[PDB]
Structure 1
């Protein structure tokens, strides 16, 4: 039997030439040399392009391997119309051959890898758009879902439109930290709903840009040293070493005294802003003061500039 009004057959994508599509002669109620006597033929050479109608067997068969996505593309139903012509008397039957889709085509991305720059200060809940894959197959044989590589910081949300199209996007849950790791590498994978499933990948290399979120810190919180009375000027007391983990200018430092630092201390001690070398500039004396406290600070060359602090305790010795 056929569909009310028209004749219809089914054939599979990429099937080898010679495959039986359907017996036109029998289904059209003909037997014997009627076929040859009636000049049973396909309507045009476009019908005989993808098909052959034998005058002997009366069988409509595949004459050429048919790639459905080259004929219908993104069409759900692929009905290929052919015109079976018979003469004596002349009649025309319009037969429609549906090309059933095969899951022979794999999901693909435009680019094998993607590079994303994301600020360290990226707040949780931040959605970042991703490349969408393509699967020329139709139905469930096209892209079904996306999977992201297991990681600590990124989840995957896929917006599913009414039509069924998928849109993958990264959702940030745990705040990135460049000082921990600056590059996160994930693999976005697109999988179609066929069995067995076919896949495509896109290598997303997230780059964490530096934010000045770290103040400089000294190797020791408090430093207690000694300095003999009447120690000759030009003497190197010590060298300060503070370090900042941030990159570039955000990691470069400048050494200085505290704002509140006494003028007496400034007169006695000098401090190199670049190296962190604390020299004694003026002659110190025990009978003037017993103990000095130098508030040292190291400031970032970033915006805004941050600063760490260290207390240098100077015990002066007694002589006479």
Structure 2
């Protein structure tokens, strides 16, 4: 019947269409036939003038509030003229404006990812929203430049987008236990509007390290008259892992000779090796002690140090 177009968020007084002209009403016709909007509801957003006969915007119109996520916003108004009483249907289309920015449910997102996460692992992300319609809604996502993750966007169901993290390289807590990424959602307007979500990846610890002694092989010498209680050497094994995965226990090799165990005694905690028995040149000119640094993680890791004792 009567179709006009008006831009969303237009200021009150904005022209929409000439009702009087498109109906054949000129001058006194507007009064004699009583030009009029249908009900009080029709005049909420519009006003029909008795002077110009033009349909204008009464109150600022928000397209998102009226039609929401509808494809086309068609606002029906009722124009009444008397003698003869004839009613005219007028459909005013509310053109969408790109005045809404992509929104996330939460400004920040935390992810607890294990250090043993294999490449190809997919981690879902919160989807953004843009109440605008057409190209003005969410178009694509971007992920801040990193060295471990990749961004993949899957469009499911009705064409809405669901972003997810794709692990490219294996994480390592020993290098950095945290990664901060910025998920940015962008719409397809000109100019484009965006919104962000701060993703902080927490790398959980995994026992992926074995204890390592300061030296692979140590050679020391003690006099023939070394008294009982004398410290030979204090072992030093390091483990970069967190918590119990980093704590270690010292011990001899499982097949260490009984002679060595009767002569020497190590403190499993401090790693201090003491000579406790007698030694001469005749018994043996040398002893080869096998040290071991057992981890406390599951599974347990271990390092090894061979100590050569000359006398």
- Fold conserved between structures, TM > 0.5: yes
Kindly provide the CA deviation profile for residues 144-192 of structure 1, in whole angstroms up to 9, marking residues without a partner as x.
0000000000000000125220000000010101111110000000000
Shift of 1:20: 0.1
Aligned residue-pair number: 311
Q: What is aligned with 1:10? A: 5
Give the alignment's TM-score, normalised by structure 1. Answer: 0.96
Shift of 1:204: 0.2
Shift of 1:68: 0.4
Whole-Å Cα distance in 2 between the matches of residues 285 and 305 of structure 1? Answer: 39
Compute the RMSD of aligned alpha carbons. 0.7
Whole-Å Cα distance in 2 between the matches of residues 94 and 274 of structure 1? Answer: 91
Shift of 1:30: 1.5
Kindly provide the CA deviation profile for residues 278-304 of structure 1, in whole angstroms up to 9, marking residues without a partner as x.
001111222111111111011111111
| Deviation >6 Å, runs of 4+ | none
Whole-Å Cα distance in 2 between the matches of residues 290 and 167 of structure 1? Answer: 73
Whole-Å Cα distance in 1 between the matches of residues 63 and 220 of structure 2? Answer: 85
Whole-Å Cα distance in 2 between the matches of residues 247 and 270 of structure 1? Answer: 29
Shift of 1:309: 0.4
| 2:131 alignment partner, SS class | coil
Kindly provide the CA deviation profile for residues 59-100 of structure 1, in whole angstroms up to 9, marking residues without a partner as x.
000000001001111111000000001111101111011100
Match of 2:20 among 22, 25, 28: 25
Kindly provide the CA deviation profile for residues 226-245 of structure 1, in whole angstroms up to 9, marking residues without a partner as x.
01113111111110110100
| 1:208 alignment partner, SS class | strand
Whole-Å Cα distance in 2 between the matches of residues 211 and 175 of structure 1? Answer: 12
Whole-Å Cα distance in 2 between the matches of residues 195 and 224 of structure 1? Answer: 74
Kindly provide the CA deviation profile for residues 179-226 of structure 1, in whole angstroms up to 9, marking residues without a partner as x.
111100000000000011101000000000000010000111111000
Shift of 1:25: 0.7
Kindly provide the CA deviation profile for residues 252-300 of structure 1, in whole angstroms up to 9, marking residues without a partner as x.
1111011011110000000000000000111122211111111101111
Whole-Å Cα distance in 2 between the matches of residues 202 and 284 of structure 1? Answer: 70
Whole-Å Cα distance in 2 between the matches of residues 178 and 245 of structure 1? Answer: 9
Whole-Å Cα distance in 1 between the matches of residues 295 and 4 of structure 2? Answer: 77
Q: What is aligned with 1:192? A: 187
Whole-Å Cα distance in 2 between the matches of residues 196 and 211 of structure 1? Answer: 46
Whole-Å Cα distance in 1 between the matches of residues 26 and 303 of structure 2? Answer: 100
Whole-Å Cα distance in 2 between the matches of residues 41 and 260 of structure 1? Answer: 106
Match of 1:238 among 229, 233, 239: 233
Q: What is aligned with 2:116? A: 121
| 1:27 alignment partner, SS class | helix
Whole-Å Cα distance in 2 between the matches of residues 249 and 205 of structure 1? Answer: 25
For the pair 1:101 / 2:92, whether they are aligned, the reply is no
Which stretches in structure 2 are left out of the alignment for 5+ residues?
A: none
Which stretches in structure 1 are left out of the alignment for 5+ residues?
A: 1-5
Whole-Å Cα distance in 2 between the matches of residues 144 and 190 of structure 1? Answer: 8
Whole-Å Cα distance in 2 between the matches of residues 62 and 210 of structure 1? Answer: 62
| 1:65 alignment partner, SS class | coil
Whole-Å Cα distance in 2 between the matches of residues 71 and 131 of structure 1? Answer: 27
Whole-Å Cα distance in 2 between the matches of residues 293 and 39 of structure 1? Answer: 116
| 1:275 alignment partner, SS class | coil
Shift of 1:56: 1.1
| 2:135 alignment partner, SS class | helix
